[PDB]
Paper text:
ACBD3 is a Golgi resident protein involved in the maintenance of the Golgi structure and regulation of intracellular trafficking between the endoplasmic reticulum and the Golgi. However, in enterovirus-infected cells, the ACBD3 GOLD domain interacts preferentially with viral non-structural 3A proteins, which causes re-localization of ACBD3 to the sites of virus replication. In this study, we present a structural, biochemical, and biological characterization of the complexes composed of human ACBD3 and the 3A proteins of four representative enteroviruses. The crystal structures revealed the details of the ACBD3-3A interaction, the 3A-3A interaction causing the assembly of the ACBD3-3A heterotetramers, the interaction between the ACBD3-3A complex and the lipid bilayer, and the roles of these interactions in facilitation of enterovirus replication.
To analyze the dimerization of the GOLD: 3A complexes in more detail, we generated a mutant EVD68 3A protein (hereafter referred to as LVVY mutant) with the following four mutations at the putative dimerization interface: L25A, V29A, V34A, and Y37A. Taking advantage of the vicinity of the C terminus of the ACBD3 GOLD domain and the N terminus of the ordered part of the EVD68 3A protein, we connected the last residue of ACBD3 (R528ACBD3) through a short peptide linker (GSGSG) to the first ordered residue of the EVD68 3A protein (T163A/EVD68). Both GOLD-3A wild-type and LVVY mutant fusion proteins formed crystals, which diffracted to a resolution suitable for further structure determination. The crystal structures of the GOLD: 3A complex consisting of two individual proteins, the GOLD-3A fusion protein, and its LVVY mutant were almost identical with low root-median-square deviations, confirming that neither the fusion-protein approach nor the LVVY mutation affected the correct folding of these proteins. Three lines of evidence document the dimeric state of the wild-type GOLD-3A fusion protein and the monomeric state of its LVVY mutant in vitro. Secondly, the small-angle X-ray scattering (SAXS) profiles of these proteins correspond to the calculated scattering curves of a dimer of the wild-type GOLD-3A fusion protein and of a monomer of its LVVY mutant. Thirdly, crystal contacts corresponding to the 3A dimerization interface are not preserved in the crystal structure of the GOLD-3A LVVY mutant, indicating that this mutant cannot dimerize through this interface even at very high protein concentrations (of approximately 20 mM) present within the protein crystal. Finally, we analyzed the impact of the LVVY mutation on enterovirus replication. Using a reporter subgenomic replicon assay for EVD68 established earlier, we found replication of this mutant significantly attenuated in both U-87 MG and HaCaT cells.
Author numbering:
A (entry chain A): 367 to 436, 473 to 528
B (entry chain B): 17 to 59
Amino acid sequence: PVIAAPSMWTRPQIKDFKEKIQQDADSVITVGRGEVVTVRVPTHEEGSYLFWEFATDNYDIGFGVYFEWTKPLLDEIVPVYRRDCHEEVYAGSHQYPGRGVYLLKFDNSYSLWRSKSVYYRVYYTR
Amino acid sequence: PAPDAINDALRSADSQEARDACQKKGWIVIHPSNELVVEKHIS
């Protein structure tokens, strides 16, 4: 199973991103104290690349990406690491290794006293 | 346009404007958040 390296980057405008994402209730997730939230994104029948964007309001949150092949095989696309996404919008992409499901990991586990608000968005190509 | 190129282009210069442009042209397609299964776990 050859697996392409992901791309990751950031872009400066956080305020505009959040204002745009807030327009959809389901695109804003509350990650509780010590909670890990997993957003599952399936590979698309016509699809090659997946895109993700996310931001938090105040505090950093853990972010990583795993791929679930269709007990099951789990590959690490993006290691989970705390991100500055409260300061800037964090984005990234990956080429489809095969048929399966992407797990977007928002990891608050290290946070004892603080919930996090996660604004996020997902695209894909053809 | 190849997906490789859509990707490398967006990465190179990324903005809401470019997203919308790509979306309008069908190059990228937004995955509705209501279709996405969300899990929660406490460590």
